[PDB]
Design a protein around this ligand. Structure first.
Ligand SMILES: Cc1cc2nc3c(=O)[nH]c(=O)nc-3n(C[C@H](O)[C@H](O)[C@H](O)COP(=O)(O)O)c2cc1C
Ligand SMILES: [Cl-]
Length: 146
């Protein structure tokens, strides 16, 4: 397909990297697992804001939590319903955080997705957050010199 996966994009997790410094803070890198999850080609989502994953059952208060984290340049972890290309709904245990350069300025946003079948709580929530935070920290290491 168009836009061969970079080594970063073959990391075995669902994530995207956006560039705020571009119009509507769009996706510039998307992992192979993210494309498998969402059913989009890479060429179908590069240069688009991630909000295309939202649909009728997505809680809009939760979306605004993500908006406010981006605006305040800070992390957030939320759960929300997202939609594939085929309209299959999935729960997304989602973690955002900024990636900072050597001056401390936000250079990218990293978003890590753990797709599930229900809203999770208690142990499943804790283990999911452990996994997506750990993942975000390796992507912050990978993405640092892009
Ligand atoms: C790095 C990054 C990844 C994102 N990943 C998702 C995602 O997986 N699912 C989603 O519903 N929104 C995701 N978003 C949130 C939307 O892109 C957008 O910020 C949100 O819809 C709020 O902005 P809006 O009110 O203009 O839509 C992501 C945003 C960024 C910056
Ligand atoms: Cl939430």
């Amino acid at each position: 397909g168009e836009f061969l996966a970079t080594t970063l994009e073959r990391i075995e997790k669902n994530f995207v990297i956006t560039d705020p410094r571009l119009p509507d803070n769009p996706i510039i890198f998307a992992s192979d697992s993210f494309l498998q999850l969402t059913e989009y080609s890479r060429e179908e989502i590069l240069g688009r804001n991630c909000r295309f994953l939202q649909g009728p059952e997505t809680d809009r208060a939760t979306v605004r939590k993500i908006r406010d984290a981006i605006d305040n340049q800070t992390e957030v972890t939320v759960q929300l319903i997202n939609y594939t290309k085929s309209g299959k709904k999935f729960w997304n245990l989602f973690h955002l955080q900024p990636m900072r350069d050597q001056k401390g300025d936000v250079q990218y946003f990293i978003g890590v997705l753990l797709d599930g079948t229900e809203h999770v709580r208690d142990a499943a929530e804790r283990e999911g957050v452990m996994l997506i935070k750990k993942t975000a920290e390796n992507i912050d290491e990978a993405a640092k010199e892009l």
